[PDB]
């Protein structure tokens, strides 16, 4: 439901179960795949000029 | 062993089990022996919110129980032990192995694992 709602998906890996006296340990494992990007840098300047000396 | 030691009163039971319709397993325990016994701790315990012992490696004992040897009895895997005391809640022991005090054949010593101690413990089937 959530993945359809927002667009994030997971990979199932395995399920394991074990018990300890009064309590039962149900253990899941998952994995995410995603790209990474760098922070938002800022320019240095903008262009408007031209000299074109045009020597001999 | 001296006479005075055997402070505790215990009931030795046998286990009979079957399967519910849902598939879960059912246990019922039958009293078979009555008598006084002496109990010694061997290892520490950790209690859940309702006193059921929590420990892996079920095969290691915690308490030593001694009582009169009986040649007409044949203890086996399916044994248990029950004890109801004056104030403290009842307790169930599970019996691991067995040993004569010596081959003099006078006293039978059991090695046991503590399981439960709370007010809701089921009492042995008479």
Declared resolution, Å? 3.6
Please indicate the experimental technique that yielded this structure.
cryo-EM
DSSP state of A5: H
Sign of CA dihedral B10, B25, B59, B52: negative
CB contacts under 8 A, A 5-24 vs B, are: 20-23
Which chain B residues have a beta carbon less than 8 Å from that of A22? 48-50, 52, 54
3-state DSSP of chain B = CCHHHCCEEEEEEEEEEEECCCCCEEEEEEEEEEEEEEEEECCCCCECCCCCECCCCCCCCCEEEEEECCCCCCCCCCEEEEECCCCCCCEEEEEEEEEECCCCCCEEEEEEEEEECCCCCCCCEC
Sign of CA dihedral B42, B46, B48, B51: positive
B37: buried, middle or exposed (CB in 10 Å: 19+, 13-18, 0-12)?
A: buried
A11 pairs with which residues across the strands?
A31
Distance in angstroms (rounded) separating the CA atoms of residues B9 and B23: 36
Which residues does a chain break follow in chain B (C to N more than 2.5 Å)?
none
What DSSP designation does A4 have? H
Q: Report phi then psi at B59, rounded to 5.
A: -75, -5
Q: Are B51 and B88 in contact (CB under 8 A)?
A: no
Give chain B positions within 8 Å (CB) of A21. 48, 52-55
Yes or no: say if B75 and A43 are a contact pair by the CB < 8 Å rule: no
Tell me the C-alpha distance between B108 and B110, whole Å.
7
- Count of CB atoms situated within 10 Å of the CB of B120: 9
Question: How far is B110 from B62, CA to CA, in rounded Å?
Answer: 11
Distances (CA, A) of B76 to A17, A51, B81: 31, 105, 12
Q: Any idea what DSSP says for residue A20? A: E
CA dist B48 and A22 (Å) reads 7
Percent helix, strand, coil in chain A (nearest 5)?
Answer: 10, 35, 55
């Amino acid at each position: 439901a959530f993945a359809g709602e927002y667009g994030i998906t997971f990979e199932f890996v395995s399920l394991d179960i074990s018990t300890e006296g009064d309590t039962v340990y149900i253990e899941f494992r998952f994995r995410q795949n995603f790209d990474w990007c760098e922070a938002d840098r800022e320019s240095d300047t903008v262009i408007k000029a031209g000299s074109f000396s045009l020597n001999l | 062993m001296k006479i005075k030691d055997r402070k505790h009163r215990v009931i030795v039971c046998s286990q009979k089990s079957d399967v519910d319709d849902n598939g879960q397993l059912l246990i019922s325990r039958t009293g078979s022996i009555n008598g006084w016994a002496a109990i010694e701790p061997v290892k520490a315990i950790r209690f859940s919110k309702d006193g059921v012992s929590m420990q892996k490696d079920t095969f290691q004992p915690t308490h030593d129980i001694t009582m009169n040897y009986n040649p007409d009895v044949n203890i086996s895997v399916s044994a248990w032990v029950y004890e109801h005391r004056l104030k403290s809640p009842p307790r169930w022991f599970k019996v691991i192995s067995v040993i004569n005090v010596d081959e003099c054949s006078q006293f039978m010593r059991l090695r046991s694992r503590l399981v439960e101690s709370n007010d809701e413990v089921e009492k042995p089937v008479s």
